[model samples]
Target: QLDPATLAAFSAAFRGELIWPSDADYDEARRIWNGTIDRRPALIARCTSTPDVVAAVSFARKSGLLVAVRGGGHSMAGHSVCDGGIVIDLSLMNSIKVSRRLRRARAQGGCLLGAFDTATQAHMLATPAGVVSHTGLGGLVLGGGFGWLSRKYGLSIDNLTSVEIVTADGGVLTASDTENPDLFWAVRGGGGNFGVVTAFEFDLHRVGPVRFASTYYSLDEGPQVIRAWRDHMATAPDELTWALYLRLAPPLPELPADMHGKPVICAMSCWIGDPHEGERQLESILHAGKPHGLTKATLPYRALQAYSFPGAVVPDRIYTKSGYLNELSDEATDTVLEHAADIASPFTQLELLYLGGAVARVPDDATAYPNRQSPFVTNLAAAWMDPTEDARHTAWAREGYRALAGHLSGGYVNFMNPGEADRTREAYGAAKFERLQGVKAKYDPTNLFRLNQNIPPS
Candidate 1:
């Protein structure tokens, strides 16, 4: 229960709008990207700058209120909102500045991946980020961002030069190699357990037009096609990022009408160089299986960055179980196909992202991020439109995860669900988790920011 005087003073000090539960736009303001989440925060602080964030943090601390931070409201587990808490919403702070001469980009925490891509692409430059254009830049980078350009360059954190963060204690600081270096290392892969990051500075690379390829094959050829892809990608150049996905084929114009809504294996890749050479390099993957459909194009990198998964436009309940695979052995391949055949819904997908290259070059201790040595990472994703079918969708993801067995190593922190907070130590190995605890104790001793994959203060 907040007193009127305290509320009024906090509101007066805040430079941004404060939405109470009784406000007219309260419902809209509390809503996040995931439709399944239905939390009503006590107050929503839509901060426009670092000072507003500091004021909100201090006020929340003084009020003894739970805190949830929102950036593009894209937390897979709905960590962006909470019941009877304070939500520090950064959506109103979206901004981006790109320097062509230095090949650098400075993006505000609330900026989405697409906005960053568009700004950087204007100068024909880019930084590795997530595939979905609407994903929040801060959340993705902090959890180890991955995309088409990762193999060629590296993970998103590998390119990060500095960050401006407002800690739980209402202290604003800059973290980089030369300043607050430990905080820089921890925040790179450690979730937002320590603070509210306001801005990110990244070293960009020259990226313009790219070659895209998509080949869909009948499920009957899943095994053969997957093996060939696995083998081909093992030695493929860093410029080529070939990925495999198993899902019910959409009614894409490139596919035959008969194959629509049927099970299919799609081999997709983005080649970063000459179209002629890319086409030549794609021959092996395109012919891996008897393709019933194929789609190839040479388009701007920005266009490719905006690509979304099927059925992403409409709001749906999403549950995902993900982990790394050291190698896609024959047994593991069979298990994956078995789950693909039993997919619970048309909106579901089994994605196998080939890992290695520059990502693995960085040692595990280089930063708080983990599983760099793993050869692959698999995501068992289940999405549906029914509120009553939540159990069914989540069960499918769990069953698939279990069936995969020994192939899975550590999990990707970005795709983690809310209930898995207990496994935070496993997310990063034992020693690394302890190191993170020390940092957490120093910057956020009271655990004020515990909504994320929290690391308790030591």
Candidate 2:
């Protein structure tokens, strides 16, 4: 265990606070977005700048301490905190600047989607990124981000122009198309396998308030509604992006009073086009089989993201496993509806993102991001408070994962479950995984950064 004396010696060169266990604010300081993760770190190296990151990394290596980097503290697999180790917390480095003339955005690694969106929207410029405004750009982008604007703008990494990171060796390096190109290629969907990215520069595009739809149907209508959603996606314009969720409904005003807390099938969508035209384009699906809940309106890009069906943060205690499906077949859809019918808790969810359009137009090998040609990405997610129910919820997710395995392949790094320590290479596929292996050997050969869904040198 790290002692106060060692931390004190290290603090001389550190620019940020060294939060130890005895610190009065230790509990609050270690509280991440996920309440399920309970870990006591030896200390938290609260990094405020690049030099601060270098110092923390150096100290961790010298002390033989494990290191976990916390950006927005939203890691689904709980890699941001470790017991008896140091957390290089970057939440304080949340600075952002936008170039209106160039339509560019440069954000510190600690910038959350919500915080960053507010800044970008002020300039009427945006990029495809995580739907929840509160999610950190670091994890989201590094793991191949997607959201409402993804259909038109592509994944968050697609908009990335450059990244500034501190490597495992405690050296600063810049990754972009023009400099350290291989590192840039690996980081696009590589996760934090090589280093700690301190900042990101993105190529932004013009986007404004849009016509968005949040609709829900009964479980009995699942077959019909899913069919309509599939058909719509086939011909849907790049300006359109949608997601499907099969789960219990919370008692929200937007949903019918009587249908509250009922099993339901819902589809949330956005169309960045004329509101009148968007409504007309959506009439057939919207009116098909009376919906238990439907709320449609024009909202500021950032406002819509803030509400995010009120489940943006996805509750702290959860198990999520995501995979790609070239097609959501009828048999597969049955498995989806079947498991969701007995959702362990109101918080449990089976979410699916329609991934095509701009996502597919980019070839599989264009960047480290593979599975670009897949039609959809499904997340078998369950959340529960009690540890006794962990078995039940985890089994539910596993069964769903198993049932869909025949029809699914390629896991998403962001949605990786806690115990999914294996299958890291399958997530990237053979060709891309091999290339990532060489780059891993080049920069992080010792593989000190193995806490995440690790991509070790092949």
Candidate 3:
């Protein structure tokens, strides 16, 4: 624990606000994007600038406190907070600047996807981000982001141009292809094991006002829809990206009253090309099964990104497990549907994200993300209202993970859980993992940035 004088000195040096256990909003400061995570840090420094980040890191090191860096605090594994440690919170550092001539945007580590989209949409520019608007660009880009536009533009790391980070030794440095190149490669998907990134420069792509296709069908049509989607996606054009969600409709005012609390399968598609071609492609999937509701129309890229679907009110306890799938065979598809049918909680859902396209077109060794050969990624997610339901929800998620373990190619480090340290090697593959370890040793030999899914130095 830090002494009062030391805390005061550190707090006074930074440009942002500081929160302690005694603060009125301390409880809110301890919260993460996932309600399930409840960890209290020794200090929460809402650093507003790069100099503030440097000061925080220096203070934490001098005080001998474990330090965790938080951007948007949206880690599925809850690595955003550390119990009894110092937290370098970047929530107040959200600032964005775009260069239309270079087609690049400089985003502060604290910026969220929604904020980035809102700013870039003015110039008709955007980058691949998570489906949710609230996810932090820091963690998402560092862990290889994938969303609706991944098929067309590629993973978030693919578009990352440069970054400014505070090193463990309190030195600020810029990393890019030409400077500190190794560290640049590691930051792509190596998690926060390197340092506290202050900001990022990303290459933006021209995208806009396009057709967004989405429809919902009964859970009973799972087998047919899954098979049809698999076949259709196999030959689908690169301009199209899709995902299948098996969820129970939430009791929301927007949804039809009869559909509330009912099991449903939703197929969401985004076509980055011509609207007429997008409609034609969607028509093929519509023939696979009779959808209860369907909506396909042209909307601004930002609008499609901001679209929201109310999820079941989950308790503060939840569990999630994820893995990549190379192929969904008949037997694998059957297992997935079987598990989907046996979903124990209304908050439980199965997500199948289609990969490949531009993401796979990049060489495996080109970036920190190594699973380019995997065609699909699966996430087993479960949420509960009661903390006591942790065991049951965890078991349900694990069972769902087991059902697809046979086809598990690797894992997405961002979606990794607590006990998944053994699989880290598999996630990055042998060669890439070795390279990451080397980079980790060079950038953070002391492992000060050990939060999140860590990649230990070799």
lDDT against the true structure, each candidate: 0.87, 0.84, 0.83
Error of 3 at 106 (Å): 0.4
Give the alpha carbon lDDT tens digit for every residue of 361-385 in model 3.
9988878987888888888878667
The residue-by-residue lDDT of candidate 2 on 1-458, one tens digit each, is 55667666679878898898999999998887666788999889899999999889878877878888999988888889888888999999999899899999999998899888888888988888887778888889998898888888799988999999999888999999999999999999999888999999999888777887787788888888888787788888987777888878878787877777777877787787676776766564576667656787888888877867544435647888789988988888888888888786778879988978888888778789879988798898888777667778888888889989999899888888768878788888888888998999988887877778788885
Ranking by lDDT: 1, 2, 3
> Which candidate tops lDDT?
1
What TM-score would candidate 2 get against the native? 0.96
User: Could you say which candidate leads in TM-score?
Assistant: 1
- lDDT tens digits by residue: candidate 1, 1-458: 98777677788889999899999999999988777889999999999998999999988988889999999888878899999999999988889999999998999998999999999999999989998898899889988898988999999999999999999888999999999999999998998987999999999999878888777888898899989888887888888898888888888777888988887887788887787788888775688678767778887899888765643554468888999988899999989998888876778789989978889888888788988888698998787888998998898898899888677878888888767777788878899899999999999999999888888999
Ranking by TM-score: 1, 2, 3
Clashes of each: 0, 1, 2
Q: Which runs of model 3 end up more than 4 angstroms from their true locations? A: 3-9, 251-259, 310-315
Q: After superposition, how far is residue 298 of candidate 3 from its true place, in Å?
A: 1.3
Clashing pairs in 2: 114-133
Please state every model's RMSD to the true fold in angstroms.
1.3, 1.8, 1.9
How well does candidate 3 score on lDDT at residue 417?
A: 73
**Candidate 2, which segments miss by more than 4 Å at Cα?**
1-9, 311-314
